[PDB]
Paper text:
AcrIIA15 is an anti-CRISPR (Acr) protein that inhibits Staphylococcus aureus Cas9 (SaCas9). The AcrIIA15 protein, consisting of 170 amino acids, is comprised of two domains: an N-terminal domain (NTD) from residues 1 to 56, which contains a HTH motif resembling a transcriptional repressor, and a C-terminal domain (CTD) from residues 57 to 170. AcrIIA15, by combining the HTH domain and Cas9 inhibitory domain within a single protein, exhibits dual functionality as a bi-functional anti-CRISPR protein capable of both transcriptional repression and CRISPR-based cleavage inhibition. Our structural and biochemical studies demonstrate that AcrIIA15 functions as a dimer to simultaneously inhibit both anti-CRISPR operon transcription and SaCas9-sgRNA DNA recognition.
Residue numbers in the entry:
A (entry chain F): 0 to 85
B (entry chain C): 0 to 170
C (entry chain A): 1 to 730, 743 to 1053
Write the structure that this text describes.
Amino acid sequence: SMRKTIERLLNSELSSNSIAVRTGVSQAVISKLRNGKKELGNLTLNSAEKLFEYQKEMEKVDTWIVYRGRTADMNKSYIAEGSTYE
Amino acid sequence: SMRKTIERLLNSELSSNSIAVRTGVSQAVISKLRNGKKELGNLTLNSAEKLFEYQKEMEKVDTWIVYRGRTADMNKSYIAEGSTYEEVYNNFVDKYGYDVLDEDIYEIQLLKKNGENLDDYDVDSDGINNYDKLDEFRESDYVDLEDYDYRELFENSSSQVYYHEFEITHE
Amino acid sequence: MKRNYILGLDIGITSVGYGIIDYETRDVIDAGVRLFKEANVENNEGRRSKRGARRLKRRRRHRIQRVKKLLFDYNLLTDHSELSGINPYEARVKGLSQKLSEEEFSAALLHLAKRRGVHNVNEVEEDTGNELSTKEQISRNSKALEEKYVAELQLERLKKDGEVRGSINRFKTSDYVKEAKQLLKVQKAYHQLDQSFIDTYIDLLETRRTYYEGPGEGSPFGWKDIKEWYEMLMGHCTYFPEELRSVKYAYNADLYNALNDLNNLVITRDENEKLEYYEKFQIIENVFKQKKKPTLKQIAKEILVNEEDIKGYRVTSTGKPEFTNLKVYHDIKDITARKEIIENAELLDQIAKILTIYQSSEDIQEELTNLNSELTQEEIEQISNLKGYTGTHNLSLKAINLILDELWHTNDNQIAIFNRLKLVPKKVDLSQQKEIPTTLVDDFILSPVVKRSFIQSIKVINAIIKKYGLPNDIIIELAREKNSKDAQKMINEMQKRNRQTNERIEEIIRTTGKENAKYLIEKIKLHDMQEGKCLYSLEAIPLEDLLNNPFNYEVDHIIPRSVSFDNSFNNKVLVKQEENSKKGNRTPFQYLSSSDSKISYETFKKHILNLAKGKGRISKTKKEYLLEERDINRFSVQKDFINRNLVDTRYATRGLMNLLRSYFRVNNLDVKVKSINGGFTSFLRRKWKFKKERNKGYKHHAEDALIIANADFIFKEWKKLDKAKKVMENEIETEQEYKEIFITPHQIKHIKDFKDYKYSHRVDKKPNRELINDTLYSTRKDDKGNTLIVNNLNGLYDKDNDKLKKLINKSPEKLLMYHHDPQTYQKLKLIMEQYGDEKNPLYKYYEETGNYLTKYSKKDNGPVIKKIKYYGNKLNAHLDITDDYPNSRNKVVKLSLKPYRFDVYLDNGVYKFVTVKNLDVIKKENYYEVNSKCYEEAKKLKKISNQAEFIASFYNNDLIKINGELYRVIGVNNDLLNRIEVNMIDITYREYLENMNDKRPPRIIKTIASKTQSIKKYSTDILGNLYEVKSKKHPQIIKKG
RNA sequence: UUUCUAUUUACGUUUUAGUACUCUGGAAACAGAAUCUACUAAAACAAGGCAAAAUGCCGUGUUUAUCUCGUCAACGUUGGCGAGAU
DNA sequence: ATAATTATGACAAATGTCATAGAAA
DNA sequence: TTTTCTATGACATTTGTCATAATTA
């Protein structure tokens, strides 16, 4: 539960309720953290891990994907590549 | 504060009180986590970051290898220590000098590892005696020693350091 | 001539750099560095352990000789008699009964004598590498020797185990004496013996020199009797010459150390912060006489105040508070608690001295018995078994009483007591001496590295005084590292810390997604230490906000730098710009007391104390700086800060400072000498931006020294710190004023541009330095007529030693076994092939069969094989000692003749040299003289004519000039091939290779045999001037030594 | 701040000698051979230098530019002293 | 309308930071 | 002796969970 990454989620433009739904942590706790009524240090490791895991997914940018497709006989091969699966 | 690393410190042989003094956390909590009366998840990030920072240093274990070498009579003792065996050789040739180990041992091992025949270079008690040829071999890109053979460099010298005993500490 | 100048010293562990600065113009008259090979305790442990051996060998030989002479007297042993075939063990057992023939008897007596065994069981001084301690071994042997004498046990071991020698044959002298007298009582009934002979033989068998008798007559390391023994072991006290130094664990000196700690303690109370005579007596009595190990909590309870108010005490490495305890007094109370013993200072002192000097308990009990005290006989036996009293040289008792009296009455500390009393060393009269005397450095107890550095530094001072006149000011820095083993440990630890911080920084850069962390390392280090909490307002601080808006937070100093003189991260914090602006050049105490802060002082203290304990993020000094309630305006408090941060306090620097100050005061020379802390020069290096690199060679030890001298000039151009100078030699400003005072890089570019950095090295003419590496390798003769050294493979059965394997597969013909005994090679090979996978096939064989590799036998009764000998290499240089070993079929040689010096000759236009080896310098009394015959033989071996002109003679580190490139000789590599070894004068070659990233081998080796146009000799004085040396026309034969 | 000394034990590297080992001649007594591997005694264990039946004694550490003047000492060269120079 | 989001609680059950207890060596 | 070892708990405070009441486009 890196303090810096959890800090990025709390300072993100993502909604407190929206973060809460995905994290599973209460919107109340998220709001009181942004309010400062609560401190990140006093947070249970379980809750801290959930916030850290949720923030990790957003750092999936810069991906490059290649498609190798073989015809049923494994003989003729079709290959294409691009930034997003689209 | 990765749960796995804290789980590793809890599973360590270090005394609950020993970790507490170093981390600043209470022996009570560490002992209760180990007993299982307390869940690592329920711990605060503040206290867990402390236990995590402790493990970090232990996780990256740094081996310290201390060379104790006694002269044949067991009377005069030579001792050097360093991080990788290569460091042990480099300290022993600085503090106590090269002429303590057998003459020209570093060169002889390098030539042997590359695969050259030692006899051609006239290996002697003084060691490489055909300096002219050694210089040519050095010119060729030699294959360097692998930090597991500096031990061999120390244990193939009996001129003065007859009894050699290496102690390796991991922490 | 006469030029006012400031002198600066950088006294390292392997160098002493000196620098000269103009008093007026910040100029640089001369810089340099004296060098010397690192002193090591080991070498002296070498000479001493060996001396200790030669002596054991000499005493054994002398006892054998005396017994042989005695047996000639009674006609039992005669020159004609042959003692060759008699077996010692079988004869001792027979003679314990029956009769012994004249030979067998002689063999047995000579035999016991060769080996008497230990006397004081614990007297032994050795490591437990044998896995069986000496005391436990004697205990087991005695438990086995209840009804059997020594000979019986040894013979039984030889017949059953097959061995006698080893670590199992360590006995006690009493059993040997019993066996000797038992056999003699029987054998005297058949041969002509008298009780005088019996007593003489028993005496010779058990005689031994006690530790307080020393060597015999005529020894330089001896003493006439026991009073002289006290004098030698204790030594005359430097402070009062006629009085001898006392022991350290003695009660009075314990009281002195404890009172030092008690005086140092500061307690925040309505009374004075320093404790006064009456409550000091109360605390010392109660705490240090009722509890074995005093703690801070006990002090707080007895004075009934808060432990939170106690500051200024020594702390252990683990953070536990440390208080020196009256160990001897509690040890007394443990056994006996009567009043008559514990309140007698002289009795307790004498008890301590006896326990410390007399190692043997039997001597201790006797010495207390001779002391007419109130001790009872039963109590003396128990007190005699006390241990851990092992300090010999400590301040004299007469001076200890004087210091204790002043300590009791006043709240002062030792340093200022010494200044007030003006105690001056009196071992050597400073008035008569023309130059600072290097003798005084011997007395202070300093490690040999520091002693050598001090002697070299004093010689540098003498040379500079003789050359450029009297120095107006001297600044002395002793470097932090105690010895090299610490320089590496520290460098390794620092590297590890740097790596962990780099790991934090790189992870932060990725998580933030910004590169701001690259210049934000100082703040980000502070953030987690404060846990993102403004220490002045308690408000939580986001790490991301610090990267996004670095200007919203600033690195403020807890204490103003005009007094704190501390610029470490301990004195730095991350605070709100408004908090720093409101705080000013003041202390956090009065500011949190003031209404400007948005938090109360008590809550601040509570948060600081809990934070300090948690996560070890607040250092010990950090909370003291934060909670410094005492006003900085007080002169004593500013002085305390200067001493803790700017003035060195280690014993070594002080002793050198006191010696120099006493010398300058006695001669009435207006010379101010001052010291600088190790971190201050690092800070002043950092802020003047001189730290480009640390591998430019030795010129680093010079440059730092220059900066040191510059410090003096910046402590007199500004009156704001001028008073502080008067404090160091013996108002309050903001931090930007501090930057204005110290950062200013004007006339400091001179250190950057100066290039004439003279260097010098210490020539080592000492003769008898060492002769031949000791390992008496045997030799054999091969088919081709050469001679091969026979190295022996050892520890074959050990798990990690794979030598046998590698040799077997690569070259079997090298094991002597291959030809002299073939069958056994077949057994070894079959074993190596089957279990070849393991690193050590022999260990795996032992792990499955449980048998060592026995020699091949038809009956399978062969002995074990633990050493296999193998031909190794050919023989080139050797000190042939074969003459000592009689009738040797094969030669016996030693290797690596250590060269003493080499003399260069110019014959027929070509330069050759003859190596005067150390073996050719024979010693007659005081003088050391070069063996003429061996020198002539070596000269003729080099094909040198008798009219060859003599050029020079080079010892170690004498400067040589070959073909125009200067070098320093380390010693000749191979004489036959005419190769000498030189390392460059400025930077050690190993470093010269790294600054070019070259991979050439590390030792420059140059050849003088041919194509050598010039071989001149240059020499350099302790300062470092380079003067070409014109030597004498005959090589030196007699060195006074 | 922890150096400088002090006494002692067992080992240990080596040679010789002996007993086992290996081998050949050979029925072998033994004769040898080989000197390899284990024990066992004795001897040497920095080159050596004193000393003279002594609980004997020194030899791997500290201190070190070189040349010179004179002074003094050991003994001519080294000292040591001083005073210079390079 | 309406839904997602934003602020405060209540409460059972923990936690950090201090002890002590008894043991163990 | 005595001095750290685990274990257990006290207490003031804070959690996590599970609510509301409001809010705005």
